């Protein structure tokens, strides 16, 4: 899986949450919705790679947000890859969604399908406009809002690892869940609640899990997602959107290969995929 | 005339569709059932056109939901196919409704939820200790998407056994004050794909494409009931907006023609067809667009309703069970999905265990 170009677009608004799993993260405001940021991120990636929308063979989306996806803020499904195809003009693309997958797992599966089907230009996109999810005020956990677009050329050669979190190996980590709001009264109310129990050692366990997995490919430089503010400068973190600056630095340094590691808060695992890069 | 090269060419592995089963709701509802008492603008012309005479809805009061019926079906299929739980390399699930309700003994305190999806929890409930879990969505064509994902993993040597699950609890999104509630229905399907040991079964080719021109026509939207009473609360509801003419009639044949062309075959080389089941007129239009005769496919929505992504595997299983599809047959499976999406697959089938 070769990364042709990376696009990223985040809201300018940051919100700080206290707690062990807290931090300062980008947060959409008002009735901003995901397409406002996803479309420019995608176009930025296409322009960098000099790829036209009509040349996109495949669009695969990842977005948990239950509303505030598109112009009609009340639509939840079908998922955002479809309205993206429409506004983008990607009239030849196949579209689907990999729901709560990590980006790393999605890139591996998409590399496999897309190389098998002979596709040349594949868009994998991740985004959130999470006004419809209540943050976890007990732990401080929130999703970062924004959009990330990876324009890729499949090769079929991406390798994959799913690894345990670090820290105490006898620690049973409690996963993220998003239960439905059982008392929706207005169409604009939150539709679900983030629930990620307060676990002070979890941010470091994730980072240790990253480092252990990277040891499977010690010859590779690597990039990673940062979901928590603990021990980060200013407590700021961008979730999976952290990958954008790291990938662009790798491009500046003219790396041809790298390892990308995601944190999956639902499985409480880390997942890595090996990639090629463009100059 | 033995060797094309001095070296040996690599070969993609063959994909065996090894086993399939379905699990439908215990209770059936007729078109005059009281559940439709608040639906306006009904008529015998409406019912006859869509071809559904009865359909099932999960009854969570009796322990039926998107998870429990999948556990039942998957355990039955694993045991009947003699598949050791630790030999499953990948589990791919789809569930079109964003609302899940049950996580078994894995997350026993979790009730109505948007996330997580099914695959990870299900792999733990079933003891699939080596299975990579994945949850995909292509609405009514998710079964074909998951067969395609499974097949590509197997072809490239990245999995030797893949369990595929589709579980449709669509009734938890239906507005029964609206005519939109009268066709969709609940059900589950499970299939096992493996690396073939001979040439008897393979996915010869597939074709997937999407078109979002009419994306807004069929959606899940947070809204009040169409004809509410009292202090009704907003819910996530299937919603139909209003033009589309020949869009769905022509695009499934487009996918089938592409798949056949990639397989190097023509319609006349196909023994049998398996279609998504949205309405008799649509299945017939798809069949006529590719040259399939009525004796080469079944209409199955009459007694099940339109089970979103499960209509295709249910119809495949029916054809195998009734002897319409035989070992050695070449078949086409094809359907449409909201979004919209279209998929077709050309299979050489061997022996398929129906269980």
Curated annotation (Swiss-Prot), chain A:
Q: What InterPro entries does the record point to? A: Thiolase-like
Q: Which Gene3D superfamilies match?
A: 3.40.47.10
Its GO CC terms are: cytoplasm
Q: Its Gene Ontology biological processes?
A: secondary metabolite biosynthetic process
Gene Ontology molecular function: any one: acyltransferase activity
**Where the protein is mainly located, per its record?**
cytoplasm
Keywords, A to Z?
A: Cytoplasm
Regulation affecting activity: Activity of the complex is inhibited by 2-aminoacetophenone (2-AA).
Q: List the disulfide bonds.
A: none
Q: Where in the cell is it found?
A: Cytoplasm
Under the heading SUPFAM superfamilies, the entry gives: Thiolase-like
Q: Which family does it belong to?
A: Belongs to the thiolase-like superfamily. FabH family.
Assembly and binders = Forms a tight complex with PqsC.
Give a short account of what the protein does: Required for the biosynthesis of the quorum-sensing signaling molecules 2-heptyl-4(1H)-quinolone (HHQ) and 2-heptyl-3-hydroxy-4(1H)-quinolone (Pseudomonas quinolone signal or PQS), which are important for biofilm formation and virulence. The PqsC/PqsB complex catalyzes the condensation of 2-aminobenzoylacetate (2-ABA) and octanoyl-CoA to form HHQ. PqsB, together with PqsC, catalyzes the coupling of 2-ABA with the octanoate group, leading to decarboxylation and dehydration, and resulting in closure of the quinoline ring.
Please state what the protein is called.
2-heptyl-4(1H)-quinolone synthase subunit PqsB
Swiss-Prot record, chain B:
Q: Where in the cell is it found?
A: Cytoplasm
Query: Short name of one Pfam family for this protein?
Result: ACP_syn_III
Activity regulation text: Folding of PqsC and binding of octanoate are promoted by PqsB. Binding of the octanoyl group probably increases the binding affinity of the complex for 2-ABA. Activity of the complex is inhibited by 2-aminoacetophenone (2-AA).
Assigned keywords, A-Z: Acyltransferase, Cytoplasm, Transferase
Q: Which reaction does it catalyse?
A: (2-aminobenzoyl)acetate + octanoyl-CoA + H(+) = 2-heptyl-4(1H)-quinolone + CO2 + CoA + H2O
Q: Which InterPro entries match?
A: ACP_syn_III_C, ACP_syn_III_N, Thiolase-like
**Is Cell inner membrane found in the keyword set?**
no
Q: Record's GO cellular component, any one?
A: cytoplasm
- In short, the EC number is 2.3.1.230
BP term (GO), one: secondary metabolite biosynthetic process
Q: Where is the active site?
A: 140, 276
Q: Does the keyword Transferase apply?
A: yes
Top-level EC class, please?
A: transferase
Q: Which SUPFAM superfamilies match?
A: Thiolase-like
The effect annotated for residue 140 to A/S is: Loss of activity
Q: Name one GO molecular function term.
A: 3-oxoacyl-[acyl-carrier-protein] synthase activity
Its family remark reads:
Belongs to the thiolase-like superfamily. FabH family.
Question: Known PANTHER family for this protein?
Answer: 3-OXOACYL-[ACYL-CARRIER-PROTEIN] SYNTHASE 3, BETA-KETOACYL-[ACYL-CARRIER-PROTEIN] SYNTHASE III
Q: How does it assemble?
A: Forms a tight complex with PqsB.
Function of this protein? Required for the biosynthesis of the quorum-sensing signaling molecules 2-heptyl-4(1H)-quinolone (HHQ) and 2-heptyl-3-hydroxy-4(1H)-quinolone (Pseudomonas quinolone signal or PQS), which are important for biofilm formation and virulence. The PqsC/PqsB complex catalyzes the condensation of 2-aminobenzoylacetate (2-ABA) and octanoyl-CoA to form HHQ. First, PqsC acquires an octanoyl group from octanoyl-CoA and forms an octanoyl-PqsC intermediate.
Record-given protein name: 2-heptyl-4(1H)-quinolone synthase subunit PqsC
**Naturally occurring in which organism (per UniProt):** Pseudomonas aeruginosa (strain ATCC 15692 / DSM 22644 / CIP 104116 / JCM 14847 / LMG 12228 / 1C / PRS 101 / PAO1)
Q: Which gene encodes it?
A: pqsC
